[PDB]
Design a protein around this motif. Structure first.
Motif, PDB file in Angstrom:
ATOM      1  N   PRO A 100      -6.261   5.748  -9.122  1.00 37.28           N
ATOM      2  CA  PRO A 100      -5.679   4.628  -8.383  1.00 37.28           C
ATOM      3  C   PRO A 100      -4.346   4.994  -7.762  1.00 37.28           C
ATOM      4  CG  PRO A 100      -6.475   3.927 -10.508  1.00 37.28           C
ATOM      5  CD  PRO A 100      -6.467   5.418 -10.534  1.00 37.28           C
ATOM      6  N   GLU A 101      -3.649   3.999  -7.222  1.00 38.39           N
ATOM      7  CA  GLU A 101      -2.262   4.123  -6.803  1.00 38.39           C
ATOM      8  C   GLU A 101      -1.513   2.897  -7.297  1.00 38.39           C
ATOM      9  OE1 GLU A 101      -2.334   4.711  -2.634  1.00 38.39           O
ATOM     10  OE2 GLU A 101      -2.951   6.810  -2.790  1.00 38.39           O
ATOM     11  N   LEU A 102      -0.211   2.844  -7.041  1.00 36.81           N
ATOM     12  CA  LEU A 102       0.600   1.796  -7.635  1.00 36.81           C
ATOM     13  C   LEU A 102       1.640   1.289  -6.654  1.00 36.81           C
ATOM     14  CD1 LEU A 102       1.081   3.169 -11.212  1.00 36.81           C
ATOM     15  CD2 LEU A 102      -0.334   1.279 -10.460  1.00 36.81           C
ATOM     16  N   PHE A 103       2.158   0.099  -6.946  1.00 37.33           N
ATOM     17  CA  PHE A 103       3.221  -0.522  -6.172  1.00 37.33           C
ATOM     18  C   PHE A 103       4.007  -1.454  -7.075  1.00 37.33           C
ATOM     19  CE2 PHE A 103       0.439   0.752  -2.764  1.00 37.33           C
ATOM     20  CZ  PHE A 103       1.318   1.165  -1.797  1.00 37.33           C
ATOM     21  N   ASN A 104       5.205  -1.797  -6.627  1.00 40.56           N
ATOM     22  CA  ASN A 104       6.062  -2.779  -7.266  1.00 40.56           C
ATOM     23  C   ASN A 104       6.732  -3.598  -6.178  1.00 40.56           C
ATOM     24  OD1 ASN A 104       7.588  -0.756  -6.270  1.00 40.56           O
ATOM     25  ND2 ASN A 104       9.143  -0.862  -7.872  1.00 40.56           N
ATOM     26  N   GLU A 109      11.095  -1.081 -13.952  1.00 35.32           N
ATOM     27  CA  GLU A 109      10.077  -0.610 -13.030  1.00 35.32           C
ATOM     28  C   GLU A 109       9.410   0.653 -13.546  1.00 35.32           C
ATOM     29  OE1 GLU A 109       8.785  -2.220 -10.881  1.00 35.32           O
ATOM     30  OE2 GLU A 109       7.359  -0.671 -10.306  1.00 35.32           O
ATOM     31  N   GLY A 120      -3.109   0.177 -15.530  1.00 35.18           N
ATOM     32  CA  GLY A 120      -2.703   0.535 -14.192  1.00 35.18           C
ATOM     33  C   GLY A 120      -1.969   1.851 -14.208  1.00 35.18           C
ATOM     34  N   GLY A 121      -2.629   2.881 -14.711  1.00 40.69           N
ATOM     35  CA  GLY A 121      -1.980   4.147 -14.953  1.00 40.69           C
ATOM     36  C   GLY A 121      -1.626   4.885 -13.680  1.00 40.69           C
ATOM     37  N   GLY A 122      -1.223   6.136 -13.859  1.00 40.37           N
ATOM     38  CA  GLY A 122      -0.745   6.963 -12.773  1.00 40.37           C
ATOM     39  C   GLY A 122      -1.817   7.264 -11.754  1.00 40.37           C
ATOM     40  N   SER A 123      -1.470   7.998 -10.705  1.00 44.30           N
ATOM     41  CA  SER A 123      -0.158   8.600 -10.569  1.00 44.30           C
ATOM     42  C   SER A 123       0.853   7.596 -10.083  1.00 44.30           C
ATOM     43  CB  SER A 123      -0.196   9.775  -9.608  1.00 44.30           C
ATOM     44  OG  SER A 123      -0.482   9.324  -8.300  1.00 44.30           O
ATOM     45  N   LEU A 131       4.071   5.300  -8.756  1.00 43.49           N
ATOM     46  CA  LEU A 131       4.178   4.172  -7.849  1.00 43.49           C
ATOM     47  C   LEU A 131       5.099   4.482  -6.680  1.00 43.49           C
ATOM     48  CD1 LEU A 131       7.240   2.880  -8.344  1.00 43.49           C
ATOM     49  CD2 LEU A 131       6.114   2.045 -10.359  1.00 43.49           C
ATOM     50  N   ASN A 132       5.336   3.455  -5.872  1.00 42.33           N
ATOM     51  CA  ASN A 132       6.248   3.529  -4.746  1.00 42.33           C
ATOM     52  C   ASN A 132       6.845   2.152  -4.496  1.00 42.33           C
ATOM     53  OD1 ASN A 132       3.940   2.351  -3.865  1.00 42.33           O
ATOM     54  ND2 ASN A 132       3.830   3.456  -1.924  1.00 42.33           N
TER      55      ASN A 132
END
Lengths: 54, 54
Positions: A11-15, B39, B48-51, B53-54
């Motif tokens: 996956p990918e992530l955001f905040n 964060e 909601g693991g890696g890789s 975030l941004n």
């Protein structure tokens, strides 16, 4: 092969957003300019508007 | 003529172990790095693991 990390999809992530602040500190205060008089107030409030007095 | 120590047995001796400590003091603390945010915690705990975030 393997369980093979090379297969399973990552996956990918955001905040949320965070507000940046541009910084060039603006002070040059306190100094001239300061110290409102009553007269430039006589310019300030209506009535008897501009242009400027003498 | 004598009791003559060469005739007599000399023992040897021992005592228990003692832990050595290699010393190059590691600190360079406290500094950056410090101060965990919430964060990078959102990176830290599952789910909601890696890789990253941004």
């Amino acid at each position: 092969a393997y369980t093979k990390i090379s297969d399973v999809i990552v996956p990918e992530l955001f905040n949320p957003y965070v507000i940046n602040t541009t910084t060039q500190l603006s002070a040059f205060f306190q100094s001239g300019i300061a110290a409102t008089d009553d007269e430039l107030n006589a310019l300030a409030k209506k009535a008897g508007g501009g242009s400027t007095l003498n």
